[PDB]
């Protein structure tokens, strides 16, 4: 059976609204003057009225700018009825598919990580690790896409910056000699994540690095 | 059955082309690869190629601008066929309603009409009527309705307008008093068509009164 496609709406659209999406028609408006209706999560269950037919028209319409984070995809079906009161169509699915628009930052999982590392291990060494996620699409953009770095470090002492961070994974590393836990036993490093894989948003938080003995 | 509604695309479209109309799909998409094609004048038939549809996608798409004065409505079928070679659903109907740009100004039937009139008929009497047609919708719109206008007169003898020209008809009458034979046995007179009755383009033509004896 011919049936309507998968229809794609970018979320946080400008309308105006209400806008046409797709029209509806069933044949038998040759014989009959026909009634469509809407039904599912989005019409006429939570949240109702998101989504409407025009009676008699068919078309089928948006009320409102979508959010992708909320409801990525509704699920509805399409009636056609007579004038007369008679079902004359088998209920057609309709999806309405909500696409991603890059409109969440990233957000550290804490404000301040605590890690530790030994005096004198090697440039090198791993540290610690940090995470940030991002609600948006990763898969198809780099909307949903992290990547680190490192803004700044204090103490400056021995040298200014001890620390890198590998930019896809979080993970802290020593590239400097000279930590030494009697002179600077800890550090506070304001690290960075920018949706885009570097390109978009920041967030910032705090990684605390204990040098043990 | 639910089948694609009529699809309504203006005239003298910007494009870019080629342009997405609308998703055909058949159900059987689930169980079976499909390939989807349309046949008709427009796509196979003169004009060839006005109208494609995408393999695979089924997305119709126009290919170019269209003008209505040229075809009104294309009326094409949709095709659905599995891999494997079989049709898979009854062809379907697709129609195309290319809606009106007032893209026409108005045309006299001639560029220099002819009437006479005797002198001393009283103010008020039709003397001869004048036609301009005009391409675009004049039932929807007033892109298709003219409005007829005298733009000048010569000579000015006795007084400078001794015509008037009904403004829906073209019917030109005397409304003055003076036509004498002997002292101006001939008028030509300027006369204009505008479409969008008054507010649109204008077309220019003659009008030549002999003053009968
Ligand atoms: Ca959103
Ligand atoms: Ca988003
Ligand atoms: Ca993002
Ligand atoms: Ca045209
Ligand atoms: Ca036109
Ligand atoms: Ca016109």
């Not at 078309?59 to 409801?71: G, S, V």
């Not at 060494?125 to 198809?140: F, G, K, P």
């Not at 200014?160 to 802290?172: C, Q």
Request: glycine share 8%; charged share 25%.
């Amino acid at each position: 059976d011919w049936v309507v496609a998968p229809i794609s709406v970018p979320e946080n659209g400008k309308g105006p609204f209400p806008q046409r999406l797709n029209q509806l028609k069933s044949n038998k408006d040759r014989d009959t003057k026909i009634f469509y209706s809407i039904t599912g999560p989005g019409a006429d269950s939570p949240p109702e009225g998101v989504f409407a037919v025009e009676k008699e028209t068919g078309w089928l319409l948006l009320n409102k700018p979508l959010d992708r984070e909320e409801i990525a995809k509704y699920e509805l079906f399409g009636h056609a009825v007579s004038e007369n009161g008679a079902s004359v169509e088998d209920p057609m699915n309709i999806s309405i598919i909500v696409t991603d628009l890059n409109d969440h930052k990233p957000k550290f999982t804490q404000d301040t990580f605590r890690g530790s590392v030994l005096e004198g291990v090697l440039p090198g060494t791993s540290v610690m690790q940090v995470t940030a996620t991002d609600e948006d699409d990763a898969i198809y953009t780099y909307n949903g896409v992290v990547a680190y770095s490192i803004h700044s470090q204090e103490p400056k002492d021995p040298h200014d910056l001890m620390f890198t961070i590998h930019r896809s994974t979080g993970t802290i590393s020593v590239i400097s000699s000279g930590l030494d836990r009697e002179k600077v036993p800890e550090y506070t490093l304001t690290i960075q994540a920018t949706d885009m894989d570097g390109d978009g948003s920041t967030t910032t938080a705090v990684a605390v690095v204990e040098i043990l003995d």
